[PDB]
Amino acid sequence: GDIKCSGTRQCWGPCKKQTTCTNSKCMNGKCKCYGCV
């Protein structure tokens, strides 16, 4: 269920709602949360 986006921040928004760890990379218009490791 990757979140569609363009920039990085755009991903952090929805990425935070799912995982506090906003640290992610928006590639191919897809948001892939890295998660807390």
User: Got the DSSP string for 20-37?
Assistant: S---EEEETTEEEE----
Architecture of domain 1-37: 2-Layer Sandwich (3.30)
Q: What are 34's two structure tokens?
A: 């890295």
26 and 7 Cβ atoms separated by less than 8 Å:
yes
Q: CA-to-CA distance for 28 and 37, rounded, in angstroms? A: 24
Name the residue with tokens 């920039």: 7
β-pair partners for 9: none
* Six-digit token string for 36: 């807390």
Instruction: Kindly state the DSSP code that residue 3 receives in the 8-state scheme.
Output: P
In eight-state DSSP terms, residue 4 is: P
CB 3 within 8 A of CB 14: yes
Long-range pairs for 17-25: beta carbons < 8 A, 24 or more residues apart? none
